[PDB]
């Protein structure tokens, strides 16, 4: 997928969200940790609780990576190449968990973006996050 209309809409939404991105990333992570507790075992050295500075920081990192990806949306394999290497080889993240995190990110956006979550923009953001997950899981072995 990833048509031109989808790319315009996802860029519009990302850019309006702006610097709140890290806050929404952290909220999405907390939602994921509480709703899908199996995912917690990849973060044993974190303290996992609401308001954790460590979770806030990691969610800010993830959001910044997503904004980089949107800023380089047509050359995404190279832009996310390092993170894909890290996620497959060092962390050995099961691919299902990217679908879980992506869903929780979408739910966070829905819960905080009343007007900006039309069906078309929902679909474009879903496809964008599915594409990021696809790239970050393409080197699984």
């Amino acid at each position: 997928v990833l048509s031109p209309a989808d790319k315009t809409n996802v860029k519009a939404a990302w850019g309006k969200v702006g610097a709140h991105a890290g806050e929404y990333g952290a909220e999405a992570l907390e939602r994921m940790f509480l709703s899908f507790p199996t995912t917690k075992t990849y973060f044993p050295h974190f303290d996992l609780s609401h308001g954790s500075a460590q979770v806030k920081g990691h969610g800010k990192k993830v959001a910044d990576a997503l904004t980089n990806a949107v800023a380089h949306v047509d050359d995404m394999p190279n832009a996310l190449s390092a993170l894909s290497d890290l996620h497959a080889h060092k962390l050995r993240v099961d691919p299902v968990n990217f679908k879980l995190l992506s869903h929780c990110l979408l739910v966070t956006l829905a819960a905080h973006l009343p007007a900006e979550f039309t069906p078309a923009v929902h679909a474009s953001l879903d496809k964008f996050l599915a594409s990021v997950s696809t790239v970050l899981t393409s080197k699984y072995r």
Binding site: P4, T8, K11, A12
Partner: protein, 321 residues
């Protein structure tokens, strides 16, 4: 002889499109490898279509079909025909059909620039007429050299050039140019570097605008802090009042403002209660000053209007004096 014909196909008119050459009754294309403005100048000359404006690979006109007739051309732009340029021979190429060159000439393009919905004839949203229709430019990469080129083309003062849309609505329809990057010497905006025509990700919330001024009308004042040197930072540009957004607002910018009023340095971005100072809809964004500028207007790439901030706004300063 007279058995060589050339035409442009799919560019909406006879003076724009992919290059197709008929040889022995078969049409074929030319690759954009080493393709350049001298070749386009030759092509636009062959159609009596005026000067060359743009060349592009198979992106603006779609992929062609058939033979690639010419590749790695070396010709000076004064040649009487494109098939008179130096070539390695018919059907010798390294290109694929993704490299099919296309051109747009001035008689098939028709460009003019105007400002719309300005406070004056030298401010407003920038619109380009292309093939009879007006459209805007997205501000992705839109800088002060581009604004300076636009102001120069309108014959407006270029001493101070702001980007952005003051009272200008969001455009509609086509965005014709994207990532305009001028050096400031170009005679027209469409001679600067830009992306391929019509290929963009921008939306009509991103529209380039300009404000051209001689500097005699730009005013800066502090209001509502009990003196002229403390309060919300109010600006008056072309007799339009607005406020500076706090996004990117630091002590360096505050020190620039304090310096313009001759009050020494900025001591606090604190809150004090004096008067009421009404709210407005037009914002000045500062990306950064070095702090050694003599005027806020000397900071580079400052944006006047064109963007809406969140609840955080209305940067205020209290200086010592």
């Amino acid at each position: 002889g007279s058995n060589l014909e050339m035409r442009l196909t799919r560019g909406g008119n006879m003076c724009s499109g992919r290059i197709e050459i008929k040889f022995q009754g078969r049409w074929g294309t030319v690759c954009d490898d080493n393709f350049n403005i001298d070749h386009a100048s030759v092509i636009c000359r062959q159609l009596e279509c005026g000067s060359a404006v743009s060349f592009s690979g198979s992106s603006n006109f779609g992929e062609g079909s058939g033979p690639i007739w010419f590749d790695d051309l070396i010709c000076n732009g004064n040649e009487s025909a494109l098939w008179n340029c130096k070539h390695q021979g018919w059907g010798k190429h390294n290109c694929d059909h993704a490299e099919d060159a296309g051109v747009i000439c001035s008689k098939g393009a028709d460009l003019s620039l105007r400002l719309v919905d300005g406070v004056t004839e030298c401010s407003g949203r920038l619109e380009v007429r292309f093939q009879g229709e007006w459209g805007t430019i997205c501000d992705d990469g839109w800088d002060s050299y581009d604004a300076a080129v636009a102001c120069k083309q309108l014959g407006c003062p270029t001493a101070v050039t702001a980007i952005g849309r003051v009272n200008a609505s969001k455009g509609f329809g086509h965005i014709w140019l994207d990532s305009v990057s001028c050096q400031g010497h170009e005679p027209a905006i469409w001679q600067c570097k830009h992306h391929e025509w019509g290929k963009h990700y921008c939306n009509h919330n991103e529209d380039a605008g300009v404000t051209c001024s001689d500097g005699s009308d730009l005013e800066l004042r502090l209001r509502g802090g009990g003196s002229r040197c403390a309060g919300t930072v109010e600006v008056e540009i072309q007799r339009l009042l607005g406020k500076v957004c706090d996004r990117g607002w630091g002590l360096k910018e505050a020190d620039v403002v304090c310096r313009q009023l001759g009050c020494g340095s900025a001591l606090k971005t604190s809150y004090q209660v004096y008067s009421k100072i009404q709210a407005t809809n037009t914002w000045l964004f500062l990306s950064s000053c070095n702090g050694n500028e003599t005027s806020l207007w000397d900071c580079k790439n400052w944006q006047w209007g064109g963007l809406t901030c969140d609840h955080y706004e209305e940067a205020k300063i209290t200086c010592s004096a």
